[PDB]
Design a protein around this ligand. Structure first.
Ligand SMILES: CCOC(=O)N1CCC[C@H](C(=O)NOC)C1
Lengths: 237, 300
């Protein structure tokens, strides 16, 4: 059934699973027309498909051409997401295919279920967790590859960089979700924290800076403070 | 006009004949039902006074044989049987009639209700849904499960309705996933109408039979089937005009006949609200929407 706080350690067991987040598939800017009406302009989007155990991220870039001449784009986007995830699964060797796919938004359940009818043994699950994967486009290298794409494209990343050499998956996911929650609550402050110290760099083959274990503890503390800071600014506390 | 004689009535029971119901007391001179209209299927059904558990009954067509009812004290129910000796049967019936120990089928001449509920129902199709080929009549009760219910357990006692499942490979063409899920016309017109039922008459017959089993026996899987067959039509953007008009008439008479006090259990809020107010056919069921709004406005 649904994934929640109670069954959270299941994310890090040895059954292959993927989270699918569709928030950033259909992205628009709303603007005024010459006549004073409102219109939208689509920009490139992405499906965020993540193995929480290994950090492997399958970033399917959604180019604005896929929406040309289509109607009801917010509904289409869910089915296009499901089409692309099903295509990804079919492209993987059998022993790499997931046993479960967890969708971060319940509106993806029926589209994914229908696209996966050929895979009756792959469980499609919702989650009660409020995960911050919408903030993936706040990671500069992911935003850059999405915006620069001129055609549909799949790009593969490890969203944990090399962290699993030193920490467990559970801890790596906790770090990722804290980073993304912070970037979602106050992007400017979060990026300031991550780069305030010019001596710490991001390796060419990495997404995040090369913090030592001790520096990650400081960074993680600064991110929590930020989240609590924003929480007080928001609610006046 | 045909007759279903009863050998006797040893236990107190409410007897149904089509949409009529009446009580019989423990051991009264009740010997059966006469003046049954020829040309329709019929259902004779039972609810014991001492144990309302298990409504049960028999679908039959008097054109196919001479049928009677006889209580079986071992199995504890009123059983339908066929009498193969015609002269024996005519003599039994004529004697019970002469002694006026039969209730007369209460049909009002103006009243087309039963025709309207059974327009497309045919004994031969009932006997394929209810499999017991040694008898010309078909037993149904409150507890019998459907083939689909069993998939999700005795197959000889199942209701073999046509399986409808909107999230199935039968319903969804590879490559038309969104199209076929949001507009079920392919599944209705090619898979079900052309493929399985052959024509809309057979589809409506199964729909009507499913409703009647839901209503007369409280058969839950029958209610599921009735609603699935409605939903498949309403969720199709392309339906022949003659089917939509007939569907409106069918549902109108089903809603009209439904006991007001059973609406809570026999009517699925989601399906009806979807069909009348959100679906492709939200404007194609004028009579049904009007009677639903005036009779069950709570549900909506
Ligand atoms: C449908 C009409 O029958 C009834 O309403 N009944 C209840 C009262 C007694 C009647 C009866 O058994 N009469 O003939 C033997 C049956």
């Amino acid at each position: 059934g649904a994934m929640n706080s109670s069954n959270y350690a299941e994310l890090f067991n040895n059954d292959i699973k993927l989270f699918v987040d569709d928030t950033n598939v259909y992205r628009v800017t709303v603007h005024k027309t010459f006549e004073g009406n409102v219109a939208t302009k689509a920009i490139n989007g992405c499906i965020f498909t993540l193995n929480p155990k290994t950090g492997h991220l399958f970033l399917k870039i959604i180019h604005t051409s896929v929406w040309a001449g289509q109607k009801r784009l917010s509904q289409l986007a869910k089915w296009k997401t499901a089409e692309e995830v099903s295509a990804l699964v079919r492209s993987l060797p059998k022993e790499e295919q997931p046993k479960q796919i967890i969708v971060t938004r319940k509106a993806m359940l029926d589209p994914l279920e229908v696209h996966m009818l050929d895979f009756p043994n792959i469980a499609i699950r919702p989650t009660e967790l409020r995960l911050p994967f919408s903030a993936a486009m706040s990671i500069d290298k992911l935003s850059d590859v999405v915006m620069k794409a001129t055609e549909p494209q799949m790009v593969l990343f490890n969203i944990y960089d090399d962290w699993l050499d030193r920490i467990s998956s559970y801890t790596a996911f906790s770090r990722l979700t804290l980073l993304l929650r912070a970037l979602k609550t106050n992007e400017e402050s979060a990026k300031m924290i991550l780069l305030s110290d010019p001596t710490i760099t991001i390796k060419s083959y990495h997404l995040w800076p090369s913090f030592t274990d001790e520096q990650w503890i400081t960074i993680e503390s600064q991110m929590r403070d930020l989240i609590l800071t924003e929480y007080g600014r928001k609610y006046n506390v | 006009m045909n007759t279903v004689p009863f050998t006797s009535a040893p236990i107190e029971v409410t007897i149904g004949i089509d949409q009529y119901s009446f009580n019989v007391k423990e051991n009264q001179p009740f010997h059966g039902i006469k003046d049954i209209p020829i040309g329709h299927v019929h259902v004779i059904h039972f609810q014991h006074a001492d144990n309302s558990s298990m409504r049960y009954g028999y679908w039959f067509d008097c054109r196919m044989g001479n049928f009677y009812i006889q209580y079986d004290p071992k199995d504890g129910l009123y059983k339908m049987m066929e009498e193969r000796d015609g002269a024996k049967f005519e003599n039994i019936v004529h004697n019970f009639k002469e002694r006026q120990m039969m209730v007369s089928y209460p049909k009002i001449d103006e009243d087309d209700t039963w025709y309207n509920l059974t327009e497309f129902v045919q004994m031969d199709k009932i006997r394929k849904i209810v499999r017991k080929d040694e008898n010309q009549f078909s037993y149904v009760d409150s507890s019998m499960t459907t083939v689909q219910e069993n998939e999700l357990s005795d197959p000889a006692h199942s209701l073999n309705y046509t399986v409808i499942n909107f999230k199935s490979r039968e319903a969804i063409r590879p490559g038309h996933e969104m199209e076929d899920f949001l507009d079920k016309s392919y599944y209705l017109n090619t898979v079900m109408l052309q493929g399985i039922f052959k024509n809309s008459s057979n589809y409506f017959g199964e729909l009507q039979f499913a409703f009647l089993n839901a209503m007369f026996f409280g058969n839950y899987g029958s209610s599921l089937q009735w609603h699935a067959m409605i939903e498949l039509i309403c969720s199709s953007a392309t339906v022949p005009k003659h089917m939509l008009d007939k569907l409106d008439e069918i549902l109108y008479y089903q809603i009209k006949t439904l006991p007001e006090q059973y609406s809570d259990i026999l009517l699925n809020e989601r399906v009806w609200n979807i069909c009348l107010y959100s679906s492709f056919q939200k404007n194609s069921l004028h009579n049904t929407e009007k009677i639903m709004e005036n009779k069950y406005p709570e549900l909506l």
